[PDB]
CSV table of C-alpha atoms and ligand atoms in Angstrom, one decimal:
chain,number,residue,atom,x,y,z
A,1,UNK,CA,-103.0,-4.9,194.1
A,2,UNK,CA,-105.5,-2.5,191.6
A,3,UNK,CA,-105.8,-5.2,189.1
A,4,UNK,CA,-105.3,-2.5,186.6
A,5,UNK,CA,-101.6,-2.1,187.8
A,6,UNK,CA,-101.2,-5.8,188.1
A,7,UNK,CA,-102.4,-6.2,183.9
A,8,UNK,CA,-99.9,-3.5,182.3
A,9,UNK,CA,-97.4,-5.7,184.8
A,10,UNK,CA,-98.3,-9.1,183.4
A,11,UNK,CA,-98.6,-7.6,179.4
A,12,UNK,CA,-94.9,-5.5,179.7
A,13,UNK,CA,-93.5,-8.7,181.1
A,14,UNK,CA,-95.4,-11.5,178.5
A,15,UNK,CA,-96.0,-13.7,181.6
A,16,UNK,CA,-99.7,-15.1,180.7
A,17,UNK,CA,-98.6,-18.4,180.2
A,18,UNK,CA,-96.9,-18.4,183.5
A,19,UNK,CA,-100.3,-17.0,185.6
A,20,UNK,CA,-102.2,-19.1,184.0
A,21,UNK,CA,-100.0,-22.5,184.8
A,22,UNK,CA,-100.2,-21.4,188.5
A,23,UNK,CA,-104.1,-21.3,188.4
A,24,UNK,CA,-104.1,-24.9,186.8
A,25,UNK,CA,-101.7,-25.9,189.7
A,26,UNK,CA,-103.6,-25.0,192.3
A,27,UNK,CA,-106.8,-25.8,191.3
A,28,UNK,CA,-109.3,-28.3,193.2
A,29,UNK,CA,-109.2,-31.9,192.3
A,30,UNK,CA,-112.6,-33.5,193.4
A,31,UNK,CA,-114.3,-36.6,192.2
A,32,UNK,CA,-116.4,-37.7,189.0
A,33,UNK,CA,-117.4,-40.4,189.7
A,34,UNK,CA,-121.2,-40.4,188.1
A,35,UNK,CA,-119.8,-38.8,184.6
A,36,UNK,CA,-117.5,-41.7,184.7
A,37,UNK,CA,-120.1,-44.6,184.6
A,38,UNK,CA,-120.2,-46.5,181.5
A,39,UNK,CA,-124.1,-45.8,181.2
A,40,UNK,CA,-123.1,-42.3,180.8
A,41,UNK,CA,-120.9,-42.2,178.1
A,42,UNK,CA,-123.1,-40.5,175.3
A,43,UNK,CA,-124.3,-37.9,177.9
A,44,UNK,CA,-120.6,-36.0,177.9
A,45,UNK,CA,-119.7,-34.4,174.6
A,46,UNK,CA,-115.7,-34.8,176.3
A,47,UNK,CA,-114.1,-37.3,177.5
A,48,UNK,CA,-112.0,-35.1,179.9
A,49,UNK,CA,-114.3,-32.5,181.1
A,50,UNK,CA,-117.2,-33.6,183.9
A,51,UNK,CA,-119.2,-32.2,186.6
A,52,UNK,CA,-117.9,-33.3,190.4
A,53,UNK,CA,-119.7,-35.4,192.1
A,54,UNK,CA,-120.4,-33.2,195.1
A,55,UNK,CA,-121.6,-30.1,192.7
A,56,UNK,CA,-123.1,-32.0,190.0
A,57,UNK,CA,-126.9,-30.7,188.9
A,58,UNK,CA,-129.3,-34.2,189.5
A,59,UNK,CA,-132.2,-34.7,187.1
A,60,UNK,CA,-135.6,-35.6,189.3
A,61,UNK,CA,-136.0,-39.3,188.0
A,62,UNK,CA,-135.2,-42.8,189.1
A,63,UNK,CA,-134.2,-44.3,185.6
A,64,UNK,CA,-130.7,-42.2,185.4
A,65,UNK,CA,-130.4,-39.0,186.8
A,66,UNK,CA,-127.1,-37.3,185.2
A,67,UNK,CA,-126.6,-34.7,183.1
A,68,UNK,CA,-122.7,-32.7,182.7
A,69,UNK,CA,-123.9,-29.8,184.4
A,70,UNK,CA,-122.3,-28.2,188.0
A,71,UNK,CA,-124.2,-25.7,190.4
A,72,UNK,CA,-121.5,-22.3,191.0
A,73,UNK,CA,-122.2,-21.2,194.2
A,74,UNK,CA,-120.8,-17.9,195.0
A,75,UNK,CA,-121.7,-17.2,199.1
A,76,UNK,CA,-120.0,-13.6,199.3
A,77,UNK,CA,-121.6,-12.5,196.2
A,78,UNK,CA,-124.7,-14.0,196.6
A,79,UNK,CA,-125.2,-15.2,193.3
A,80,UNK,CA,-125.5,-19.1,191.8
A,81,UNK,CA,-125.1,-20.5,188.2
A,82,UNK,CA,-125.5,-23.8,186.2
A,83,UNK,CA,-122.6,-24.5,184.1
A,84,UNK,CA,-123.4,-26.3,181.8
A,85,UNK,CA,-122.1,-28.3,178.4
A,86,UNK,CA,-124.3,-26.8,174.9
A,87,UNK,CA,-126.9,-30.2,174.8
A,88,UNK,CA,-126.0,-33.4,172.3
A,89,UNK,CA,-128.8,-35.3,170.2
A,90,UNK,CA,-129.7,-37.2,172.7
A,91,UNK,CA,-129.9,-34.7,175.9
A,92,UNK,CA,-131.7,-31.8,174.5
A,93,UNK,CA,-134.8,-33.5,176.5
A,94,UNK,CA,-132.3,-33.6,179.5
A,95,UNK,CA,-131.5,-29.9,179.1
A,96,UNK,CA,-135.4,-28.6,179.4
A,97,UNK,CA,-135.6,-31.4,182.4
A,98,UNK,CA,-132.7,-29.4,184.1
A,99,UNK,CA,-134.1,-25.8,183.2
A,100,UNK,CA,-137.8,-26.9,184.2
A,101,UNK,CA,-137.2,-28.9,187.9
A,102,UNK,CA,-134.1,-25.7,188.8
A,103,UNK,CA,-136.7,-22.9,188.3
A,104,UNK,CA,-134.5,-21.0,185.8
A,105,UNK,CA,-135.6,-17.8,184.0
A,106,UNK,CA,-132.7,-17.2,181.6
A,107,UNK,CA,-130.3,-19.8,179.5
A,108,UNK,CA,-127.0,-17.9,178.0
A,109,UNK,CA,-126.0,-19.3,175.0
A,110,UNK,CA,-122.0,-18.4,174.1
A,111,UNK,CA,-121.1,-20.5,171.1
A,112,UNK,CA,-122.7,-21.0,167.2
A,113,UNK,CA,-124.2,-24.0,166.2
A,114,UNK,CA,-121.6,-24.8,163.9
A,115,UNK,CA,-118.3,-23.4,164.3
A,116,UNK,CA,-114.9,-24.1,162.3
A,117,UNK,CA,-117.2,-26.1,160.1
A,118,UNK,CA,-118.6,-28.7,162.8
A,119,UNK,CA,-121.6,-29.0,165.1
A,120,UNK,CA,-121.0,-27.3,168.5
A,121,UNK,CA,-124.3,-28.2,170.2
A,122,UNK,CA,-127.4,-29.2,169.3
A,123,UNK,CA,-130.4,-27.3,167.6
A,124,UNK,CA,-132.2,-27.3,170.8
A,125,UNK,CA,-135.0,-24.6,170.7
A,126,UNK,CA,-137.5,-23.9,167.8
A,127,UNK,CA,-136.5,-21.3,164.9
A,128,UNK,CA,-140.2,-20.7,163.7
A,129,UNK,CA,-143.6,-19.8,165.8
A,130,UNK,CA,-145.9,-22.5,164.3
A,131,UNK,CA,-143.2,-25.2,164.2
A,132,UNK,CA,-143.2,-26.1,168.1
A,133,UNK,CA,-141.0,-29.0,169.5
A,134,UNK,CA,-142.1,-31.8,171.8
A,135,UNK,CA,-139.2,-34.3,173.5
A,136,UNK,CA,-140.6,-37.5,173.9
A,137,UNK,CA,-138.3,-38.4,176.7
A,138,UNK,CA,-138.8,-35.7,179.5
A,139,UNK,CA,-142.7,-35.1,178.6
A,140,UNK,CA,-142.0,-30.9,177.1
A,141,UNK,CA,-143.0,-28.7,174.9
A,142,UNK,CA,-140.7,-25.7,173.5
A,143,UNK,CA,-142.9,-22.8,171.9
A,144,UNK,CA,-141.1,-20.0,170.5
A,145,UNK,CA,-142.9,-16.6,171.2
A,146,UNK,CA,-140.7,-13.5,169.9
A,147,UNK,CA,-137.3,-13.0,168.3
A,148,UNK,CA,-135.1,-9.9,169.0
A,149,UNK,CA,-131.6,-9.8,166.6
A,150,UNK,CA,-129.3,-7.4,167.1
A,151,UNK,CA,-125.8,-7.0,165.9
A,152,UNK,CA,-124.0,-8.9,168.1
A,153,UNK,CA,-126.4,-11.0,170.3
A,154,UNK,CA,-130.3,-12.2,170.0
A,155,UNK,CA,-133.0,-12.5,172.5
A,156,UNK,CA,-135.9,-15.0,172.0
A,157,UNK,CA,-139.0,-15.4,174.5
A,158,UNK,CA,-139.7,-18.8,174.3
A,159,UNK,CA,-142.9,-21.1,176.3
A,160,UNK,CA,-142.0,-24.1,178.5
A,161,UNK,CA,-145.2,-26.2,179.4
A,162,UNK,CA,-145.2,-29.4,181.8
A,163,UNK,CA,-147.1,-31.6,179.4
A,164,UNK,CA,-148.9,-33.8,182.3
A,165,UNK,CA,-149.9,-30.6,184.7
A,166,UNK,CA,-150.3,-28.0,181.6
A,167,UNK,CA,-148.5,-25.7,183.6
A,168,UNK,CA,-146.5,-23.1,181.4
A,169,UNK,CA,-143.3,-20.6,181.8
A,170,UNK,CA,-141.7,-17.8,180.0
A,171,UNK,CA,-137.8,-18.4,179.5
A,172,UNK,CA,-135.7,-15.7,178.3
A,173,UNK,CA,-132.7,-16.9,175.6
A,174,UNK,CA,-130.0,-14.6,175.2
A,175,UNK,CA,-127.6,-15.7,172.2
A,176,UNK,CA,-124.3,-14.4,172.1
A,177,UNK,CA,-123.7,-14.7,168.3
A,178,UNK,CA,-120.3,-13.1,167.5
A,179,UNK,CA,-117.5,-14.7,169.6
A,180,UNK,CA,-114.2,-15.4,167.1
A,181,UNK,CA,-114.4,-19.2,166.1
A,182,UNK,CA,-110.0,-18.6,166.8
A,183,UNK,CA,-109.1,-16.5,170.1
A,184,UNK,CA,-111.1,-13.6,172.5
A,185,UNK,CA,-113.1,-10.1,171.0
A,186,UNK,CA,-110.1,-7.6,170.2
A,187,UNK,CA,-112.1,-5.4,172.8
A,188,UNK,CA,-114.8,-6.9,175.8
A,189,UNK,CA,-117.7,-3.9,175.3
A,190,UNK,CA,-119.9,-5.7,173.5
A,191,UNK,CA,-119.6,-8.7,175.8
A,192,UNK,CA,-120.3,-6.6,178.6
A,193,UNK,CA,-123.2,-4.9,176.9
A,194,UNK,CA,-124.4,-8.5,176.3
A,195,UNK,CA,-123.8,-9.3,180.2
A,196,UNK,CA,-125.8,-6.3,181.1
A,197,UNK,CA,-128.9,-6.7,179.0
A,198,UNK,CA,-129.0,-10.5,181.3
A,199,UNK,CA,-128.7,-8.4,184.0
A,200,UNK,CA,-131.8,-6.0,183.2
A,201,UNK,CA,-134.1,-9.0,182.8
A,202,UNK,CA,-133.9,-10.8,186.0
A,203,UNK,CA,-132.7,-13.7,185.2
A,204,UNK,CA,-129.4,-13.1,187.7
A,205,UNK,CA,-131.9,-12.6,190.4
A,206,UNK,CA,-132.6,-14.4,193.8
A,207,UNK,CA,-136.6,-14.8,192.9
A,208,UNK,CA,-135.7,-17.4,190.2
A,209,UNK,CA,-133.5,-20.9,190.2
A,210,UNK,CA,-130.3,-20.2,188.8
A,211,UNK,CA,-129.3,-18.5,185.0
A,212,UNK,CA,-128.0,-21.7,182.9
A,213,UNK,CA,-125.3,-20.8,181.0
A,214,UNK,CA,-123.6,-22.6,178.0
A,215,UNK,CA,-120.9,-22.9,175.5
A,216,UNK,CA,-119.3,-26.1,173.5
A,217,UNK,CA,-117.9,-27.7,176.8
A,218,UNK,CA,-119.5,-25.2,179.6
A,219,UNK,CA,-115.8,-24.3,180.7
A,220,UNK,CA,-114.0,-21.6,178.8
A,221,UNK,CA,-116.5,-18.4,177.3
A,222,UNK,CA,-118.9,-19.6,180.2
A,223,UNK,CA,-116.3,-19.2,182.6
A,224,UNK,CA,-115.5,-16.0,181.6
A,225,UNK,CA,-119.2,-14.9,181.6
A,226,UNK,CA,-119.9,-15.9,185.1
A,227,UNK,CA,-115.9,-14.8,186.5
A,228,UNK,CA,-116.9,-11.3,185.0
A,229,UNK,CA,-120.4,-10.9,186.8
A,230,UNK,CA,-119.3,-12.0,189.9
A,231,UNK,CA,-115.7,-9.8,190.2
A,232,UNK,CA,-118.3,-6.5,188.9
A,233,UNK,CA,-120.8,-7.5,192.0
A,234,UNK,CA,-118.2,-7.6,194.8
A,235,UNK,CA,-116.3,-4.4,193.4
A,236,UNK,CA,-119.8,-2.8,194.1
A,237,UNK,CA,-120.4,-4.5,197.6
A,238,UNK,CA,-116.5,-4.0,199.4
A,239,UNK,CA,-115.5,-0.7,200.7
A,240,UNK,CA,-112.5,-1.2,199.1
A,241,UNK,CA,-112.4,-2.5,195.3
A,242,UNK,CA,-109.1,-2.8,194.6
A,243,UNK,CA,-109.1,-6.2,197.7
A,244,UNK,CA,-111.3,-7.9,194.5
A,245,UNK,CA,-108.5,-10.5,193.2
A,246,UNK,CA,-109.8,-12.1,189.8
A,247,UNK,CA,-107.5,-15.2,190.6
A,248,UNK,CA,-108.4,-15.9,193.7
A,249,UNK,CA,-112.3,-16.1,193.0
A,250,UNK,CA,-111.5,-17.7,189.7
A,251,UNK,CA,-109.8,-20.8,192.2
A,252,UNK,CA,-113.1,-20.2,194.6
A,253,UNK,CA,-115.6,-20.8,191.1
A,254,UNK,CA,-112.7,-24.1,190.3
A,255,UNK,CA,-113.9,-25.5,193.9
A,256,UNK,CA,-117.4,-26.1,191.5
A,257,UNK,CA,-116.2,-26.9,188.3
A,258,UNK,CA,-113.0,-27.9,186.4
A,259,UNK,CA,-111.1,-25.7,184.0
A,260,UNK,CA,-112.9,-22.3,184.1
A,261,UNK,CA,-111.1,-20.6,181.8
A,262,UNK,CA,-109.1,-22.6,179.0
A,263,UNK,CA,-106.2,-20.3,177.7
A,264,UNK,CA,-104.4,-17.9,179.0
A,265,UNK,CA,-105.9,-15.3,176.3
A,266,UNK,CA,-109.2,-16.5,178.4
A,267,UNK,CA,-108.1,-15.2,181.4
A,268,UNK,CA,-106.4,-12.0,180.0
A,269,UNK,CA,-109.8,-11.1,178.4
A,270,UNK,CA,-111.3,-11.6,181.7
A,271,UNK,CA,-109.5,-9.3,182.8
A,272,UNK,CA,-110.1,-6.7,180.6
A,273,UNK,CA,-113.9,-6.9,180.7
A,274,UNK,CA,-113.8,-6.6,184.7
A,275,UNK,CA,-111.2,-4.0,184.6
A,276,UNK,CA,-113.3,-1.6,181.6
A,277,UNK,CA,-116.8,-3.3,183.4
A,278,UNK,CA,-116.0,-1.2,186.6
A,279,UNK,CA,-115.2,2.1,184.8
A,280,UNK,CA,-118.6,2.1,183.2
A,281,UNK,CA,-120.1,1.8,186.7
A,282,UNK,CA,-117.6,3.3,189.0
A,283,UNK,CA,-116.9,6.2,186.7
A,284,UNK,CA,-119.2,6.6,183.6
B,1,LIG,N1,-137.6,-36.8,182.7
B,1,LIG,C1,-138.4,-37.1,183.7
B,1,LIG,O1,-138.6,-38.3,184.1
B,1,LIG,C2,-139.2,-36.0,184.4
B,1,LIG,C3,-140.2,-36.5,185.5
B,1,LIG,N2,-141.5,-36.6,184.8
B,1,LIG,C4,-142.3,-37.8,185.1
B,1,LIG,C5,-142.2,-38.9,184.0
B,1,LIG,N3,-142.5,-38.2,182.7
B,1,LIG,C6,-142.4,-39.3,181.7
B,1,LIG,C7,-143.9,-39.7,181.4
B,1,LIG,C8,-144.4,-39.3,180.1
B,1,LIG,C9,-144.9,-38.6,181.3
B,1,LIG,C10,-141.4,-37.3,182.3
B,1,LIG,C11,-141.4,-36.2,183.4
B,1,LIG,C12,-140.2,-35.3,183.3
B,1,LIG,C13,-140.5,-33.8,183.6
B,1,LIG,C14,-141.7,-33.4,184.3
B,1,LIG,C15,-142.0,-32.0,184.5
B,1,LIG,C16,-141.2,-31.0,184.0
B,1,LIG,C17,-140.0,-31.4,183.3
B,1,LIG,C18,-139.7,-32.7,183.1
């Protein structure tokens, strides 16, 4: 059913909530068994959302290899993701480990710093050129190179280097900066402006390890960012585009991680940005 049809259907009848309820329902219930280990405690910023065991991202070391991250791996669209939770004090070293040993280009950042006046995630890259940071832990160093700031999202080049080889790599940033600290945007264009400029730079693409992408608990606005790419790239590989249903890849993306999508104002802004995303393309 065009999904169009099916929205003005859901809003004239209020029946959010009840969608949404079905979703959790059905959703896959798989193992955690790793994120659970008492050793693992201060790796997980919450206590009830973890990576699944048969999904989960493994750092390359003996000592402990966990980290709350889950690989999204989307076979008819032909793209993957790291979901992943924004990095505490003491995994920021864990973080560059991931990005590093995975091959990654890009990292999308969705949240703040500090939002509703407490700390979201970790300060995790440099904010000055001749300021550089080193973690001690996973043998890194973090250069910034350029800063771009625009209204509603930055872009920063920054320099990765493998402290024992010397080897070096250009990751992209992109920082989503104006997300509501309460609710979704009132309207999803500059979300999907932001989508497109990760687009543009490679980072979605099949040469490089998979884009990490980040929020507070890597579940809710980085659901939405990776539910949105992936329903715009089958509407532009079918022969039909009205077969795309939003909730049934939504439950395929759940097989990989839990609660994609957090509130039901979540998933009506998904939605939106898939159903204006397409016009912009298959229209404009
Ligand atoms: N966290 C880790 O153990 C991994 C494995 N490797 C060997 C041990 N070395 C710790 C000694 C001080 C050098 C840390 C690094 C690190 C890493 C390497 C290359 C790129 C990204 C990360």
């Amino acid at each position: 059913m065009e999904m169009e049809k099916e929205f003005e259907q859901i809003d004239k009848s209020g029946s959010w909530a009840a969608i949404y309820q079905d979703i959790r329902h059905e959703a896959s219930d798989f193992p955690s068994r790793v994120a659970k280990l008492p050793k693992n405690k201060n790796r997980n910023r919450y206590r009830d959302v973890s990576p699944f065991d048969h999904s989960r991202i493994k750092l390359h070391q003996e000592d402990n290899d966990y980290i709350n991250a889950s690989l999204i791996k989307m076979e008819e669209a032909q793209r993957s993701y790291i979901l992943t939770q924004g990095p505490l004090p003491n995994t920021v070293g864990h973080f560059w480990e991931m990005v590093w040993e995975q091959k990654s280009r890009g990292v999308v950042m969705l949240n703040r710093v500090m939002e509703k006046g407490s700390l979201k995630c970790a300060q995790y890259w440099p904010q000055k050129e001749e300021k550089e940071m080193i973690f001690e832990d996973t043998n890194l160093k973090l250069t910034l190179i350029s800063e771009d700031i625009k209204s509603y999202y930055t872009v920063r080049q920054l320099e990765l280097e493998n402290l024992t080889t010397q080897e070096t790599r250009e990751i992209l940033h992109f920082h989503y900066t104006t997300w509501p600290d309460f609710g979704v945007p009132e309207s999803p264009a500059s979300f999907l402006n932001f989508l497109f400029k990760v687009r543009e730079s490679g980072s979605l693409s099949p040469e490089h390890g998979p884009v990490v992408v980040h929020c507070s608990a890597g579940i809710g606005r980085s659901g939405t960012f990776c539910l949105a790419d992936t329903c715009l790239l089958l509407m532009d590989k079918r022969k039909d585009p009205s077969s795309v249903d939003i909730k049934k890849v939504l439950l395929e993306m759940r097989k990989f991680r839990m609660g994609l999508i957090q509130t039901a104002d979540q998933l009506r802004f998904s939605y939106l940005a898939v159903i204006e995303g397409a016009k912009f393309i298959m229209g404009d």
